[PDB]
């Protein structure tokens, strides 16, 4: 079909335009709740770990797809391999609270601890990217204009301190995995495949035996 390309109104043609037939599609696997709901390993800190979803590497399935949203919501599960007992403290806690056992503490039971945690941030939703500051006592943020170069001022910014699901602490934490529960994603952002050197990106794919 011809259309006005400048418009931005989505145009979806079908193989019927030249005598084919559109088939049925079952899209259960590209549903945000389902695909986000699997564990992903993170490299832990020896002892204090603040629970921050932006810790999962950007190349992973969950890191890739979490960064393709601007704002998101979820509850959380973690599974942790640790020495001693594991204490978790909600968003907003003083870090010295990590040492008090009335705060949710799980006693060591081999091989690991898996916990269901609530969303505790003070915000209706959290963001993978945030164009601003949370420290007050500063000078105002500039209203930047210019080309892409102008965006290099922002690289030393850390995401607001309120963007976390609390923190956990144990004597040694050896392994940490996150799993997003009931996930919601808003405002898509770029998702990048590997860029090939060749005409086609080629990989050894799993094939029979000999």
């Amino acid at each position: 079909t011809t259309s006005a390309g400048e418009s931005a109104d989505p145009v979806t043609t079908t193989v019927e335009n030249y005598g084919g037939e559109t088939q049925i599609q079952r899209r259960q696997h590209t549903d945000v709740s389902f695909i986000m709901d699997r564990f992903v390993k993170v490299t832990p800190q020896n002892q204090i770990n603040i629970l921050d979803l932006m810790q999962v590497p950007s190349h992973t399935l969950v890191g890739g797809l979490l960064r393709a949203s601007t704002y998101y919501f979820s509850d959380l599960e973690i599974a942790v391999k640790h020495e001693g007992d594991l204490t978790w403290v909600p968003n907003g806690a003083p870090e010295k609270a990590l040492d008090n056992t009335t705060n949710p503490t799980a006693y060591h039971k081999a091989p690991l601890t898996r916990l269901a945690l609530p969303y505790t941030a003070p915000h209706r939703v959290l963001a993978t990217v945030y164009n601003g500051e949370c420290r007050y006592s500063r000078n105002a943020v500039p209203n930047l204009r210019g080309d892409l170069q102008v965006l290099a001022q922002k690289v030393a910014r850390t995401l607001p301190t309120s963007f976390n699901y609390g923190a956990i602490k144990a004597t040694r934490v050896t392994e940490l995995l996150y799993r997003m529960k009931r996930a919601e994603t808003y405002c898509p952002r770029p998702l990048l495949a590997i860029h090939p050197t060749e005409a086609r990106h080629k990989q050894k794919i799993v094939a029979p035996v000999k």
């Binding site: 400048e6 943020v141 500039p142 990048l192």
Partner: protein
């Protein structure tokens, strides 16, 4: 579309006591929603007010599109930007604010030019790698392509992790104009095209009145 050498795709947008008319319209792009969400939440304790006098067009120059600009040349404008009018004075009289944006971008050369501009409204734009520019159409956008049109119009709502913003420390939206195909002037096009924005804040709500300096 409609008729001989010039056109009747004709739109007049009104924001306050200011109007803008194009005869090469192409329509408006609504981003992420058709309406704002709730303006009156728990975080303002019923103390917020609408200030209808700020909902009107202000203007800024963006850049000059010339034949040496290549695919991926961008111009960003973070929003809100400096406003020396009644919207601008709100940001110094109230601690918290929220508004969407009705955005109109112009690139007038003539129909003997070629090349193409993508104009887009991106939230929380902190960084954009070159390869991601191939997916900028993910965002609320419209093209300016000389053979068809000279105006892009995008209308977008307030977005944010919080229902009211503090604009002195956070910029929710960035207008980005990107060159997707380089400008061609041939024997009859305009030698270059200056790109201008005409922007209106929409639905402006303020809360939390500041002292003066008196």
């Amino acid at each position: 579309e409609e008729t001989t050498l010039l056109e009747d795709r004709i739109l007049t947008t009104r924001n306050g006591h200011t109007t803008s008319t194009t005869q090469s319209s192409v329509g408006v792009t609504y981003g992420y929603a058709t309406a704002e969400d709730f303006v009156s939440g728990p975080n303002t304790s019923g103390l917020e007010t609408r200030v209808v006098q700020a909902e009107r067009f202000f203007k800024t120059h963006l850049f000059d599109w010339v034949t040496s600009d290549s695919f991926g040349r961008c111009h960003l404008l973070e929003l809100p930007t400096d406003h020396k009018g009644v919207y601008g004075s709100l940001t110094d009289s109230y601690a918290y604010m929220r508004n969407g944006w009705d955005v109109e971008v112009t690139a007038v050369g003539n129909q003997f030019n070629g090349g193409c501009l993508l104009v887009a409204m991106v939230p929380e734009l902190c960084s954009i790698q070159k390869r991601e520019l191939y997916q900028l159409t993910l965002f609320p956008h419209q093209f300016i392509n000389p053979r068809t049109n000279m105006t892009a119009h995008i209308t977008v709502p307030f977005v944010g992790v919080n229902r009211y913003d503090q604009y002195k420390v956070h910029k929710p939206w960035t207008l980005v104009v990107m060159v997707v195909a380089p400008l061609t002037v041939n024997t009859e096009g305009a030698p270059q095209i200056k790109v201008y924005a005409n922007i209106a804040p929409t639905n402006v709500h303020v809360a939390g009145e500041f002292p003066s300096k008196e």
